[PDB]
Each structure stands twice: as C-alpha cells, then as structure tokens.
Design a protein around this motif. Sequence first.
Motif, mmCIF file in Angstrom:
data_model
loop_
_atom_site.group_PDB
_atom_site.id
_atom_site.type_symbol
_atom_site.label_atom_id
_atom_site.label_comp_id
_atom_site.label_asym_id
_atom_site.label_seq_id
_atom_site.Cartn_x
_atom_site.Cartn_y
_atom_site.Cartn_z
ATOM 1 N N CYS A 100 10.276 -3.247 -9.204
ATOM 2 C CA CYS A 100 9.362 -2.283 -8.614
ATOM 3 C C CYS A 100 8.841 -2.809 -7.286
ATOM 4 C CB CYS A 100 8.187 -1.981 -9.547
ATOM 5 S SG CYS A 100 6.974 -0.839 -8.854
ATOM 6 N N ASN A 103 2.984 0.260 -4.516
ATOM 7 C CA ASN A 103 1.680 0.188 -5.161
ATOM 8 C C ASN A 103 1.822 -0.249 -6.613
ATOM 9 O OD1 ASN A 103 -1.165 1.859 -6.093
ATOM 10 N ND2 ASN A 103 -1.109 0.828 -4.101
ATOM 11 N N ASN A 104 0.982 -1.203 -7.022
ATOM 12 C CA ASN A 104 0.970 -1.721 -8.391
ATOM 13 C C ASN A 104 2.352 -2.216 -8.812
ATOM 14 O OD1 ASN A 104 -1.135 1.043 -8.842
ATOM 15 N ND2 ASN A 104 -1.878 -1.074 -8.825
ATOM 16 N N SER A 105 3.055 -2.862 -7.881
ATOM 17 C CA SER A 105 4.379 -3.387 -8.191
ATOM 18 C C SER A 105 4.301 -4.537 -9.186
ATOM 19 C CB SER A 105 5.082 -3.829 -6.909
ATOM 20 O OG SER A 105 4.264 -4.704 -6.154
ATOM 21 N N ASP A 154 -2.496 6.098 -10.934
ATOM 22 C CA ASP A 154 -3.854 6.287 -11.430
ATOM 23 C C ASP A 154 -4.014 7.578 -12.220
ATOM 24 O OD1 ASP A 154 -5.959 8.305 -9.721
ATOM 25 O OD2 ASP A 154 -3.970 7.975 -8.853
ATOM 26 N N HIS A 197 0.807 -1.212 0.000
ATOM 27 C CA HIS A 197 0.000 0.000 0.000
ATOM 28 C C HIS A 197 0.844 1.268 0.000
ATOM 29 C CE1 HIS A 197 -3.257 -2.670 0.403
ATOM 30 N NE2 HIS A 197 -3.247 -2.805 1.717
ATOM 31 N N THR A 241 4.631 3.847 -5.155
ATOM 32 C CA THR A 241 5.304 3.044 -6.165
ATOM 33 C C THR A 241 6.751 3.493 -6.319
ATOM 34 O OG1 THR A 241 3.246 2.624 -7.360
ATOM 35 C CG2 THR A 241 5.306 2.366 -8.576
ATOM 36 N N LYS A 298 1.343 4.009 -16.259
ATOM 37 C CA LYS A 298 0.318 2.981 -16.114
ATOM 38 C C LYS A 298 0.095 2.614 -14.652
ATOM 39 C CE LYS A 298 -1.237 0.929 -19.122
ATOM 40 N NZ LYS A 298 -2.469 1.044 -19.951
ATOM 41 N N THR A 299 1.166 2.546 -13.856
ATOM 42 C CA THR A 299 1.004 2.153 -12.457
ATOM 43 C C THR A 299 0.208 3.193 -11.678
ATOM 44 O OG1 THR A 299 3.026 3.168 -11.584
ATOM 45 C CG2 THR A 299 3.225 1.011 -12.657
ATOM 46 N N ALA A 313 2.070 -5.029 -11.650
ATOM 47 C CA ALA A 313 1.852 -4.504 -12.994
ATOM 48 C C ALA A 313 3.120 -3.870 -13.549
ATOM 49 C CB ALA A 313 0.705 -3.494 -12.984
ATOM 50 N N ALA A 314 3.843 -3.120 -12.715
ATOM 51 C CA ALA A 314 5.094 -2.515 -13.156
ATOM 52 C C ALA A 314 6.125 -3.575 -13.520
ATOM 53 C CB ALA A 314 5.639 -1.592 -12.069
#
Lengths: 237, 240, 87, 230, 239, 7, 146, 234, 236, 129, 242
Positions: I148, I151-153, I187, I29, I32, I184-185, I155-156
Amino acid sequence: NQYDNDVTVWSPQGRIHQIEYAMEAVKQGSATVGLKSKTHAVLVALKRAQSELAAHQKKILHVDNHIGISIAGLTADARLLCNFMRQECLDSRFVFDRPLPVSRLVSLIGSKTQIPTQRYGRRPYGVGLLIAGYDDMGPHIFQTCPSANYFDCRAMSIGARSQSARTYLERHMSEFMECNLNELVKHGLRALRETLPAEQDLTTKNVSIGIVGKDLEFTIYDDDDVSPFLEGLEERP
Amino acid sequence: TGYDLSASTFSPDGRVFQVEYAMKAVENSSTAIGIRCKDGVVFGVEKLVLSKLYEEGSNKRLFNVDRHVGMAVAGLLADARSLADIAREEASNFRSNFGYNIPLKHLADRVAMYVHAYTLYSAVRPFGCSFMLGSYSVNDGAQLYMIDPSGVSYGYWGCAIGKARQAAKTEIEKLQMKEMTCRDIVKEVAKIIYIVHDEVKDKAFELELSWVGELTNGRHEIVPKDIREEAEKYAKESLK
Amino acid sequence: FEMARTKKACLIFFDEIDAIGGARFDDGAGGDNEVQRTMLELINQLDGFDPRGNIKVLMATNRPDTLDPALMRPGRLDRKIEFSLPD
Amino acid sequence: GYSFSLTTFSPSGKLVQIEYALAAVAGGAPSVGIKAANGVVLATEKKQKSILYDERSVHKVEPITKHIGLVYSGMGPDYRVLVHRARKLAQQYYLVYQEPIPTAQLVQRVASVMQEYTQSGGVRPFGVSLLICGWNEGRPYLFQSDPSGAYFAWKATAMGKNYVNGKTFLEKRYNEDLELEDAIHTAILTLKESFEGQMTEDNIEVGICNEAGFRRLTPTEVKDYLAAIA
Amino acid sequence: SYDRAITVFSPDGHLFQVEYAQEAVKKGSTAVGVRGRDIVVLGVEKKSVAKLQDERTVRKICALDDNVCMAFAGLTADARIVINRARVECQSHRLTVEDPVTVEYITRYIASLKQRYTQSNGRRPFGISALIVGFDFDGTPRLYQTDPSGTYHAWKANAIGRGAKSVREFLEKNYTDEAIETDDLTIKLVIKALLEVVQSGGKNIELAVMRRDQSLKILNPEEIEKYVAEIEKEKEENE
Amino acid sequence: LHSLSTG
Amino acid sequence: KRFDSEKAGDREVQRTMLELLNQLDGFQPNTQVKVIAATNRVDILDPALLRSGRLDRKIEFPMPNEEARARIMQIHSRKMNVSPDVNYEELARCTDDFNGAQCKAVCVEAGMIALRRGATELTHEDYMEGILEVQAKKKANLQYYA
Amino acid sequence: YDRGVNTFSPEGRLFQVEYAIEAIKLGSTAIGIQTSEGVCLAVEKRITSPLMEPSSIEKIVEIDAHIGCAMSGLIADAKTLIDKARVETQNHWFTYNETMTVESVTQAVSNLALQFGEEDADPGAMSRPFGVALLFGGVDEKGPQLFHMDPSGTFVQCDARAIGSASEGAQSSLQEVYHKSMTLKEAIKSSLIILKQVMEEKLNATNIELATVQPGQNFHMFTKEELEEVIKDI
Amino acid sequence: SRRYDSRTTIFSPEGRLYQVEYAMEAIGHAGTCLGILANDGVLLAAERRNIHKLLDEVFFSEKIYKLNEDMACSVAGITSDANVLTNELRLIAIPCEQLVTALCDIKQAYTQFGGKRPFGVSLLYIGWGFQLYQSDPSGNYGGWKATCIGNNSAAAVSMLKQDYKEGEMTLKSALALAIKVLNKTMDVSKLSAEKVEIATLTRENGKTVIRVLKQKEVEQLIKKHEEEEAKAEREK
Amino acid sequence: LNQMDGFDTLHRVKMIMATNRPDTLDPALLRPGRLDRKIHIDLPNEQARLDILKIHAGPITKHGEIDYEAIVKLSDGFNGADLRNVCTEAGMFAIRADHDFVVQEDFMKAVRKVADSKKLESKLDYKPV
Amino acid sequence: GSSAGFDRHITIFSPEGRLYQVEYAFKAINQGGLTSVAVRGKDCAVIVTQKKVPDKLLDSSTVTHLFKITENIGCVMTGMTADSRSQVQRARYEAANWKYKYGYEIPVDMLCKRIADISQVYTQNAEMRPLGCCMILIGIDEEQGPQVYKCDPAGYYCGFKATAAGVKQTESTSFLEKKVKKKFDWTFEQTVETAITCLSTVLSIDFKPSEIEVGVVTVENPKFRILTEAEIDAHLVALAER
C-alpha cells in the motif's frame, strides 16, 4: 561582504571587488621590472623558490621572436595567457607574414581578459603581465592587469614590494632613453634590488633577464648567462 | 538588503541599483567633454597620469570607432575599450552590409542597445563606462551623442562625463557653440578642461584633443600637436 | 567607559563583540536599530569628539566579517590579530 | 536561463510555489463553467476599472478550435500564453490526424504544459486556472486545469474570487437535466452572487459550446440573457 | 543544462558531498565479501524481511558478468545505475578484447565513474559502496571494494554498510588460512561475520557464492539455515 | 491559428 | 529613516528625531545656532533630515588620495623621530584604499616596529612593514605565485 | 554555498585552489629525490587493515617507460591526471617519434589544473580542482629530473621534494640529508629513513612503494625482495 | 543564479536526499492505493479523493492507468507528475520489471543531476507470471505480494502482513481483503463504492484482461464484507 | 482621537496637522470625521518653482540678466527649501569669489550643486492610505 | 504583503499570489517623471507627452518619447529610456516581420499583443527583469478605425478610448474619463485639444509649443506624423483663445 562574491556585482561605490581581489594576486607575485630605451626593451624578474631544494619559478616567458613577457601571480593563468598570445603571434605570421605589433597584441589580450570580468561565474585572470617587445614603432613596455586594463609604460614594475622599484624607475627614468643595453639592464637590476630586503641580494639563481632589441631577438638569460649582467653593478648602500 | 546584487532585480521603488552603481563608476573618473560647434565636433579629455612611468599616450580615452566617428570615454577603461570594439564592429558591419558610413544616430542607437542588453540579466553586469560618439558629414552635419551605462543615448551640443561633469557643463553653457567653428572650440575645450581640473586633488593631467569636422573632411583625427599646444597655452593663460 | 575613565589605566574585554557589533543596515523595518545604536555608542566612546582616555579595549569574535566597518577601523580596533588554526 | 527548478518540495511535502499560484488564481475575476445536457456555458466577470478601457478589445473567453473554448481565472497574460499554447497544440493534433482535437486531449496537453512550468528550470507556475469547454461524440465536456497541471472533469464549477460560495451555490442549483439556456441562466446567477455592482452586457463575458461548436456570445445576447435575470 | 559545482572543496580540504555519500553508505545494509581459495562468497544482511515482499526483486547481490558479481551498500537506485553501467561496459570490453573482464578492470571502471560523478558539474556523488568479487582468467579469486569517493582496494575479506566496522574487526581476527581451507569453511566464516551484526539470525542473510569456472549461485534459505545450524553446533563444543 | 489570434 | 509597521517599531527614537527636525527648521525659525552633523552612512538617514533647510550643505568626505595620504602620514609623524630618508610619496603609493585613520595607524605601527627592534629612529622600512600590519591581510602561504 | 568555484579572496587567493591544497595534508607522505644517478620515488601505503591487500594500493604510477609519478592526497582525483599524462605522452611519440621531456609532461598535466568552472563551461569540464599533489620523476636529455605539481597548476623542478601529511618534517630532513653529488642508493636509503621516522605504522617491505628511473634503465618498481634488501639496513 | 538555486540534487549532512524525503511526505498525504497479488490475478484498489458531487465521471479510471496490453499502474502523489510518468511509461513500453526499472531509472536520474525537483509520485504496477511492483520518487522499486502507498499506508501494510495468507488466494479472497483493509484505512465507516476504485488484471483465454469493476460490483463487495463483519460481531 | 471626534462635539475649534509621512498615521486619525480635508503640499511644479525662486531671490543683490527659467528647468524635483538653498548657495559662490553681487552663473552653479546634493535623499512620495 | 524566500528578488509568486518584481517594474515607469496621454477620436488618434530639456546643452531634437514604429503606427513610451528604446526596436522588428511573413501591415492590437507576449516571458522567467517601460501605440485600422493600446510591463494590454501613463496616470485617467462620459465623438482638432488640455490641467503648466510632443494618426491619411512646433502652437493658441 555581499558585493565581493562575484565579478558581475557592482559595489555601491562603483567598484567590482572581485576584480580588485584578482589584482591583489599580482601583488602577491614576485617582483619584476620592465624598462625600455631608444632601441631596447628589457625585463628583469626576481624568481622565487618555495624551498631551497626546489628550483626558482620561471617568470619570463618567450611569446614570439620579438615579444616576451614577465608574469606575476597565478602561474597557470600566466601559462594560459602566454599560450593565447603565442597563438595570436603565430596566427599573425601565418596570415600577414609579419610580426604582430606589441600595441596591437596587448589590445587583444586586454579584450580577452575583459570578457571574464563581466560574465556570471567567471573570474579575472589572476596574472599581471609585463610585455617587452620591438616593432617598427620601436621598443614597447606594456603592463597588463587582471582588470583587463593595460598601460603603455616607459618603465613599469609589478609584484610584491614593486613600488620601491617604481620609485627607482621614476628617479632614473630620464636617462633610460639614451643609455645602451648594458646600462639599461643595470638600471633594471638596480630597480629590482629595491624590492629585496636589506640582507638579500641579487644572485644568478633568482634573476632572469629577457632582452629584445632592434636587431636582437628576444632572448632569456638565466643563472649562467645572468652573471655577465650582475657583476657590473656595485653593492647597494 | 539584496535588492542591488543583480541587474535583473528591481528595487521596491522601481530602480535597478546595479546600473546606478555602474553610473557611479563613471562619476568616479576624470572629466571628458565634447562640444558640437557649427562645423564639427571637438572632444577633449583630462587624462590624468597616475605615475610619470606611463608613456605619453597610454590609456587613450579618445577612440576611433570609425573613419568619421570618434569616441570619448569615461569610467572603466576595460569596459570602455570593449564598447569601443563593439562600436567598431557595428560600424564595420554597417559598411559591409549597407555600403556607406554609418550615421551617428544609428551607431549611437545600436551601441546603446548593446549596452542596455547588459542591464537586464543577472548573468552579466552593466558596463561601467559612459561614452560620447561624435561625427561630422556634409549631409547629416555635426552630431554628438552621449550614452550612459543604462543605455540612454541622447544628442547634445555640449556634454561632459566624469567627476567634474557639472562644473564642465556650467563652463560649457557660457559658449555660443552653435556659431563658432572648430578652431575656436578647441581652445575653449582646453580652457574648460583646465578650469574643471583640480590641481590640489589628483593632478598632472594631459589634455587629449580630437575633432571631426569639415576642416578634416568629416574625418575624426587627433588634433595636430601645434594646434593642441596653442590651445594648451590659451587655456593656461585663461587661468591667470 | 565612564567608570573605565575613573582609573589611571584600564582594559575592557569585549568577548563575542558580534552580538552587538554587527554592521548597520536598513531593512525597511526597525531591524536591529537598538543594537546598532549600542554599537554606535561604543564606537563614539572609542574614537569620537572626546578623547577616549587610557582605556585599551580588546574584542574577540569568531565572526569578524559581520562587524561594522566603523568598528573595524584603526583608532577603534587598531590591531587585528588572527587566531588561525595552528600549523 | 536558470536550469534549476524554482518549484521545490517543502518539508511538509507541499509544492509551495504551486499553492501560491493557486492563491493568485483565487484572487482573479470569478469564472463559472456549467455543463448542460445539450452544451456547456463558460461565464466570467469581465469588469474594467474605468470606461476608458475598450471592453471588446480583449476577450477573456477565447476559442481554441471550432468546438473548444477557454475561460480563465487568474492572471491575464498567463492565460494569453496558455491560449496560444492550446491553439498551437490543437493545430498540431489537427495536422497529424486531420480531425479537430478532442476536448480531453487538449486539456491533457495544456495541463502537461502547465506541469512542465512547475518543474522546468528558472520558471514559475502559471497563475491561472483554465475552464475548457468542448463538444465531442455528441456529448459536452467541461474540464478545469489548475496551475499544478492537474485536470478535473466538472459538471459545474467556479474559480477565482468567491469561488467556494459559487461552488456551494452550484451544488444546490445544478441538475443533470439542465438545458443550455437554463445553464446560461444558472451561470449568470452564480456570477451575480459574487458580483459587486450591476452586471451589464459589457462587464461580463459568456461563451457557449453546443453541437454547432463553440462561440462567445455577443453583447446583445448577453443583454437578453441578463434581462431574463431581472 | 544544469552546470553547478555540487562537489566543492570545503575550507578544511574535504569534499563534503563525498563524505555525505559515504554516510549514506553507512546507513545501508551490511554486505560482507570473503575471498577464499577457490570460492568467493558475498553475504548481505536482508535488513527487514517482510513476508509480503517479493525477495527476488530486492537483491543486493547482482552478477555484473559470468565471472564477476558485486554486492552494494547505500542507495539502491544509485546502485542500480552503477550495476547497469558496469554490465554495459563488461559487454563492451568482452566485444573489444574478446576476453571476459578482470575484476580489476570492472572495479577500476566503477571507481572512475564514481570519481567522475564526484568532479562533474550538476552531479551529486553516487551514494553506494560496492564489494566486487570474481575470478580472473587465470583462476585467481579476487575481491575489491569501491567507495563513493572513487578509491578502490583489494581485500582478503571486507564488509560495508552500517555494521561494517564490527564485521571488519571480526574478520581481521578470524580470517586465517585454516578458516578458508574449504568452501564450507569460507561460507561459515561469512555467515559468522554476518551473525556478528544480524540479530534474528539466518532469516536476514542472503548469501551467494561463486566458484571457479562457475556462475554465481544464490544460496537457498534452507542451505543458510543448515549452515547456521552447523555454526551453532560448533559453538557448543568450543564451550 | 492566425485567424484565431487576429479575429 | 521612519517606517510604517503594524506590530512593532522604534517610534521613540523617531519622536526624538522629529523633535530634532523641528528644532533645525520648524515653527520657530532658529537662525542663531549653527548645527554640524557627521555620519558614515547617509543612505540610512531620514529624507526629512537630509532636507535643504535642515542640512543645507552635505559635504562628502572621500578616501584620501595619494597626496592626501602622504600629507596625513607627514602630519602624524610630526612628534615622531623619523629618519630623513622615508619616502612619504612611496608610502602613499603603497596605501591604496587607506582612510586617514589607517594612514595614522601606519605611523603608529611603524613606531611599534621601531621599538620592537630597539631603533631610536624610524626608517622607511619600518613604515613599509607597518603598512602590512595596518593592511591586516590574512595569513597566506601564497609563495607559489609567479 | 554562495561562493562560486572561481572566486578570489581579498588576499588574492583562489578559494577552491587553496582548499584543494589543504587536501594534500591528509594524504600519505611521498618523497622524491633527483640525483645524477637517477630519480627515486617513495611513498607510504598507509594500510588501514590487515585484510586490505597492499599490492592494490598503487601510489607510484608508470607514466611512461622513462617517467613515473607519485601521488598524494585524493588518489581518486589523481587517476584523471595520470591518464592524461599517459595519453599526452605517446602522442608526442606518435607525432615526433620521441619521448616527452619530463618538464613537458608536467606542464601538460599542469594545464589540466584550473580548468574547472561553474558557468560558461563545457559539459565535460570539471567542477573542482584536483585535490592531489603529483611528483613526476624521469630521465630525459637533461638527465634525471624531478618535478612537483600541486592543485594550483604550479609545477616546479625540485632536487628533493616531500609531499603529503609529513611534508614539513620530511622536507626538513631532506634539506638536512640532501647533497647534489650523491648516489642513487644513498638517495633511496635516505628517503626510506625519512619515511620510516614519519610513518604511523612500522616500516616494512609491504606498506611502502619504491621506484627508480635511472639513465639507460627504464622505470622500475621495487619488488618485495629488493625492498627488504635496502630496508634490512634501515 | 547561485543565490536562487535550491540545490535539489545534493546530499544532506546525514547522507539523505531531502527532496526525495519531502516527495515521499507528499505521497503520504495522497489517496490510499492498495495492490494485492493472487494466484489467478492482481488487483489495484485506490481511494478516490475526487469525490465532489459536481465532479463529472467521464474517464475510464481516475488513478488507475493502462500502460500497455499487459500492465496497469496506479499513482499516489502529484497527479500531474503522475501523468508525466505514465505517459513516459507508455512510451517506454515488455516484462513488468523492465518497465518499472526504466521508469525508476528516469526517476533516479531526476534525483542525481539536473537540479530539477524529483517526481513526487509513488506507483503500484500490476502485470503478467502475475506480479506487483512498487516504485518511489527515489527510483527505488521492489516487488510485493501485498502493498500500500499513500494515506495510512503503514496501517494497511500491517493489516496485510497480519491477514495476507501467502500463496492461498484467488481473486475473490484478495478482493475481500482489499475491501477489509480499505475500510480501516479510510476514515469513512461505510466506504461507499463511489469513494474507491478497484481494477483487476487476470489472464483469460491466453490474454491479459484489465477491468475496472463497476460500481454495482464494488457495492456487492462492500455489502459482503459488512455482512461478514456482522457475522463476526455475532460471535461477541 | 476622542477629542477631535468623540462623544462631545467640538464646536468652533479647528485642527491643522502637518506631516511628511502620512502613510504611518493611524487610520482612525486619517478618518474624514477627524481630518476632514487632506491637503497635499506637493513638490513645486515649473511655475511654482519659478514663484518660489522669485520669492527667495528677491532680496538678493544682482546685476545682469537673471534667467529664472533655466534654474526652473534644472530644478526639477526640488522643493521650496531646495530653491531657498539655491539662492543661498548662489550668494555663497558670490562670497567665495569676493563679490558684492550674484550673477546668473552663480545661480547655475548653485542649482547644479543642490541637484547633486539631492541624490542622497530617499523616497519622498508618501500619501495617506 | 507577506513574503517567503526570493519572491521580492525574482518573478516568483508571493504567499498571497503576487509578483512583486512586476509591481516594482510598474513603479519604474514613474522614474522618468514624464506623463503621456493618448486620446482616440471618431477618425483620429493622438498621443501627447511632455518633453523635458533641463539645459540648453541637450539637443532638444533628440529628446523624443514619440517613436514611429511603422508608417501607419506610432507610439509614445513612458518610463526607463533604454527599456523604451528596446521595446520600440522590438516592436519595429515585429512589425517588419509581420509585413514580410503575412504581406500586410500589422494591426495595432496585434502589435501590442505580440509585445505583451514578449514581456510576459520576462515575468515568468527569473533570469531577466521586466522592462520598466509602457508603450502606447496609436494607429488607423482598415475597418475598426482609430486604435489606442496601452502596453505595460506585466504583459497586460487593452484597447482604450483614452489612456495615460506615467507619474500623473491616474489624474489624467480621471480627467479623460470625465471627458468621455460626455460621449462626444471628437474631431481631430477636438481630440488634440482634449489631449493637450488633459496634460496641461493635470500638470498645471500652461504649455508652450516647445514642452510637448504631439503625434497624430487620421483616417484621411493613415500615417503617423509628429506635429511641428508651429502646428502645436496653432492648437495651443486655439486652446488659449477659448
């Protein structure tokens, strides 16, 4: 079951359940009787064997030249307490060049066994002691409890089925003072017989006798040396 | 409920229940009384014999924490002996540091604080014994303090600790203790101990008597056997 | 217990008695008050002012430490048979 | 003392005790810190529940050095402990370097202590948020240290009760060209919005840091600044 | 200081923390050790090989000394501590005795350390099992296995990790004197045992050998691919 | 330090 | 005891208890009916019920002491064929922390054991061994003690 | 859990001690016999795989030239007790120029048991009892001697004692076959017979350990040839 | 004492360390953080979550710290634990792997004994050849080319796996990749320079230069990336 | 609630409500529009305890001086029912000794017994919110 | 009043940010059943507290909640007696240490500041409980004059023109607030009479000169003295005659 998990938790009835549980460990131990006369203090212990191919566990330990104990309960805790008492008796000789009085030694052991009964994470010594000694005040029989409370008894008995021995001692307590050593040992053996089942009997294998007197050092008698004491007493009804 | 498992936990009503349970442990023991008369303090203990096998003098609830201070205990005898040793070492340290016998007020305030030190943490439990410290000196005078498991030390004229504490206090209130001497207060202490004793309940008690006053030159000693037997006879006669 | 008393001899088996046989407690709120009342009624039927009758009860539980001390008392549970693991 | 941590990670990955300490902070008296061009102002609602309390006996805005001051929102005793800790750390830094501690360094050390209380055994996090104002290199400094031990550099911020609306007020009422007196005016307005009742010279505490150092305003100066409000 | 008995006896007589550490080992990558005639081979399944991962840093085979190397299975961080302690003690023993440590000695120290961590206040057991191979001073190849409990054993061939049971079953059937006649046959046996669990193939095999009077040699991916090609060729002629 | 605590 | 709650509570049983309280000492003083109550846990009762107008005397029933335990065993052995050698004092000494129900169960289990071996007269050994049954001590192999 | 290590049951049992005693029943069966001709120790290796080297399964340990020990249960726990036995011995020799009594060695090892705790303990203090049972066998002034030690610290001399998973049946067989005046060869044969009937696997010279401490002679671990010599009978 | 102990350093019945997993959840949480390795330098691109309009900008960087003259690190998780770990990193500091190993030894020791909660911080290390490392609260570290955390690790990491051409990257291509991934990571459809924090480590004149890019340079990178994306849209 | 204070105004009708647990009452019921006054019948103080004791010890037949002050001093925390019980237990002690009168010692025993019995009572300090 | 875990058993925060153990320690102050009132005047400070002697057996000379921390500083304790004695002993030790280390008498504000710092640790560390006692210190300062400081289990502390602690703390606080609103710098006799009137009116006792203890400090003699029964009787008669 929430007030019994620790030795620092008082139950609402003003009782410490861990101390009572440690006290029950003495009741799990084998019976032993300590009685005194005007000049002697003797201990008679009924040794127990886990199996008939194993030796009987020793119950009477030599603490000092004038003090010897009989244990009931955890044997390792008994060894710890015996080592402490041996060290105290040795330090008394090293400092004052005199034997440690029994009344003044039981006080130290009752103060030592009280510390674990008040601190978190500690446990009471799961061993009850019957201390027989001689000093300038005469013979002494003391009973030391896991509750760290000790009693100066004319004739005590602790262990499994020890209350029958207590009854016998109470019945014949009046004649303990004036009887000689042989009669005192016979009284102790007869008291110990009350703790046995009907079919069992006192044999040399399961009887140990520790004697201390005015001019007699504390001596422990075992299977070969117990026969001069066992053969005198008659068969129980 | 979990509010009484530790001495470091306060109840929602602001009471430490471990201390109260330790107090109940004291309330479960036999009654020991102590009366501060004109010229000393007299301690009496109803020391029950649990069996005839214990010798005459076992489980002595009357202690000597100093040469001029006596201690009468009620409750856990192991904790009682531990506190007796604590008081003994406190008096010894006072003598070794300041050079004179410790005043009873200071000894009470010190041993009471040691007791209170066990009512704050979960690492230890409160002492399960309540004890009275009595002393006499020509300068300070007769003093009698009681300390409970919580650590509250209060001076007293006549005090009692045990299961018959209320009846003993009622009997004590009849006495004009502020005027009579020790030689009468021993007899009255014997009478009170015999009155509050319950023979149909736990029976076969022994009267443990001690005193500290000007007749002992400010020294706490066991009452001589002749005086103790005279007091016992008077107490037995008072019961008709 | 009323219908158990309409028979000359009867046995009642209380399987998993720890469901209702738990020890009484006061947690501020009404924690398990009704279940404690049910357990109290069972205790009163077992040994109360009126004689129980020829009913011989039998309870089985894997949590005997949670049972009320009044329920674990002789006259209500006289025998305590332990089913320890076999040797 | 207990050797096990009283703050642990919840299954959702949250230091729950830290969140509860922050909740305790959000229930404290409102505090506003505004960094002007020529100084910083720290204001707080020092309101008592009765006239019997001596207003001048205890001060919520306390100095740390001749140029650094704190104002808290949260629990009073915890702020006193952290005040003593900050003063001791400042003395250590001065003794080592023979120079008053920079504001950022003091904030870092204090936040390190507050973090230590979130990991050490048998202790709870401090229930206070500290607003630290200082002057270094001819520039003003304002920082906020939360119970977690995290420090943020704030141009203007509000903590305690009604702090979110205080922040929103500060967004629409603060510009970087503000002067110290206008900063005091804005801080008093921010307190007034969250204030209930009337603000006297005694029920609020204001301190200011400028080139001359840090000093807590006397009640007379607060009275003049408050008369400027109405 | 934190003094709590983390590892205590269950009423059943088990040390549940030790069993949980063994489970953590069972969640690790499969490491296979085979003791040959003049070579000891250690092949570890590389779990998943990301193309962005620096494969040099993630290495489950580490040389404790010039003659001893071990491959672990379990928690990588715990294994690093165990390896560092073993290296420090290897250097200390070399300083004291003026002789490189034997495989038994370092295995015994590692197992004793693990047992100490299963019986000390405030410490949870190490969650790693080790396969320690090497050569003694007399040239005898040795392979040993230690588990989180602290018990170690000598093995002709063994496997630890998630696929430990199946690979050990395969090794019990194909470990013969003929299968370890040469170094190439030993390495082929190791690669076959790893291929019993590894799905993709030679890409997920990190293999390192050690020969007598030689240091640990990590096999390059092309060498492992060549060995897999040899095994695939030999498969056809047996059909 | 002492002056800061006292005032 | 009554309690304050926002979501749920046992207000009906508390209403019944309040009716009982009014009956014991309420608007109409009822001084012709005597009321006796019994309980194991007085710490649970509502303080308005433990009042000094509703329950004037709160008698504590203690654990039977040694003499009381011997007396209870003698009471419950009246209709039982007991040999004239049982030491009820010894049995009382062996039954620490026994309530009266456990003391009665001691005699009941002694009768059980006498029937088990076929004896028509209860001996002291039967009472001693039934004390073990009533104690309900868990099975243990603690033969390595002492 | 809520309970500490030093907690007493309502029956007077040390909880962790009993739980450690229960750990022995999962260990391999060991049988010790004391006779006038010497002490014979036997143990089953319990090999779990053909790849495991039997020689690495050491369950009978040379304590000293006159004393050996056979362990059962958690073998890893027994290493500390073995090391303390072998260090405590040679410390008696260092100070008194004599070998320890077997009873003294067993007592010194017993003192280690129960030396565990949670609070008010040294940093090096243990957290749990030693979940192992030891069978010391040696020769001293009292001739051959066999002692049994269990995680409760209770050590006792035994004529013939069997510990481990098959302790009950092996002990019954020992009671059936033991007589005080029998030779050491008879003791070895009887112990091997008792082991063979309780092993899960089939008895051979590889899955068992045999050792003897005889008067005059030193502690001797039986080799494969010596094992096969006595196994070839039964 | 035993009642209030949460037993952080114990094993779950499945062999897992629940406190370590919960710390990793906490990091999941966090902001990134990207680390990309090139042939001439390394870069750290951290998403800035302290984006309040009233937050003063005084520090050289927010999540990117300098450990020694050769290394830089970026953190994801509890910021105060990150400060503690970075101070200890500076005290320990040296080869990059040695520093990472020492800090990971401390972090692992916190998960093995002591009873304290673990350091809920994941770190990305960049240093000088050029190397990038990632460390977890468990003390498990690993080298990487592109990675990465936060957050959104996932996807990265997938985007890097698809797009990171191994070996053939300069600093410019790596920076473009960092912007492309961060777009992209995060928002935000625009990804203004004020919500990102890029620092590059490069070897110049035989010395290590760690520089945090100015907001103008970051805006230039974002503009170039959005223009390239528009050029790609021109195809469709 | 609608009857005490609702749409129809209540005229010349007064409501007295008694409870020993006002903390559990509905806030609408405790609202001053319905229960305008909240009269706290608190535990008796020293003078109040003296008055209640004189009220309840009035019809008790006694000879000898009766020091009500001592009973007041040892009656701290008592209620009115407690003091009536003190008088009743003093008479009961008189009956137990086979007496036709009550003396001060009987009152002393009675008040100490009532104080002992007071230890079983839980929290009583409950106030309307 | 939400709870989560052991927030009611140890000094850790509740979900809403409350230390329930500290609040229970506050409730522990009223367990003693005694109320103390301190009033500060223009040149004097007075502490008054009811002394309860249930039976003649108790030595009334020893039932004293008034403690002489130093010659120039006095205190009145409300709450648990043992915790009160602990706080008094700690305050005496801190005063002596201040005198030894700094050479001058400890200021009244700093004494309770140190005591509250000591008691704050009890509200942060979970192995100990907060002391269930409240200290009210009174003393004559060199420049500030009379000083009255209440000092609570939470580690909170503040100066007071007139404060009160115990069961009747709020009613006495209201009475003293009403008296202070009249804004009169009371003389010594007026301060003593105001404190006695506050205690009497709140408790409705009509005191005798054996049911209250009064300790005063004045600028003319900056020493703490406990009024004798005759001195208290003089003030009682003066109050009664008006």
